[PDB]
Design a protein around this ligand. Sequence first.
Ligand SMILES: Nc1ncnc2c1ncn2[C@@H]1O[C@H](COP(=O)(O)O)[C@@H](O)[C@H]1O
Ligand SMILES: [K+]
Ligand code: NA
Ligand SMILES: [Zn+2]
Length: 180
Amino acid sequence: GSHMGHWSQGLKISMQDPKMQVYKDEQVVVIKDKYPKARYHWLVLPWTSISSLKAVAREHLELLKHMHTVGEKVIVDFAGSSKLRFRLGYHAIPSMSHVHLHVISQDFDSPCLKNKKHWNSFNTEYFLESQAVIEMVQEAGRVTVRDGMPELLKLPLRCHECQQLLPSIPQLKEHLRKHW
DNA sequence: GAATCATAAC
Ligand SMILES: Nc1ncnc2c1ncn2[C@@H]1O[C@H](COP(=O)(O)O)[C@@H](O)[C@H]1O
Ligand SMILES: [K+]
Ligand code: NA
Ligand SMILES: [Zn+2]
């Protein structure tokens, strides 16, 4: 297939679709995640093309902080009266091209969350806190990721709220209900 | 049988 039409370039198309955009300014766009892994799941992307956190440098520090600020504003505007917790962050190893910040509610109540990989990508060190990434860029000048990230995706299912170990995704989804 | 493991997508 073509480069432009490859599955990995999908965000570059979605970020330009008015029906997916929930906020725009001079620097960033916010879209709904197409396969949300919780009740609220947005992606914040800069208009400027940066392939991944591997290409981030100190020139991008203000932009990374701006993406975070916008993420927090979207939470207020769209889910302010919600009693939900949110996290903002980046997958240690992304799949989709173009840097994008995850803004996701912590219920993890969604049909699109289907496997151990989905769970661990948001609930282990594989999920890099937005603030941590920002501070690493500020102090070290670039983002580095330690070895062993793919292995984290295979860890036994463990609830993010109470640390209980669950034997399956259906049982985990059931268990999560108690933290509503 | 239900659910997960890994592989494949030309
Ligand atoms: N065409 C698309 N539009 C919006 N979000 C997408 C699209 N394709 C995949 N996603 C989401 O983008 C994220 C990509 O994961 P990652 O590359 O690990 O950050 C996942 O949360 C997907 O559900
Ligand atoms: K198995
Ligand atoms: Na991947
Ligand atoms: Zn729990």
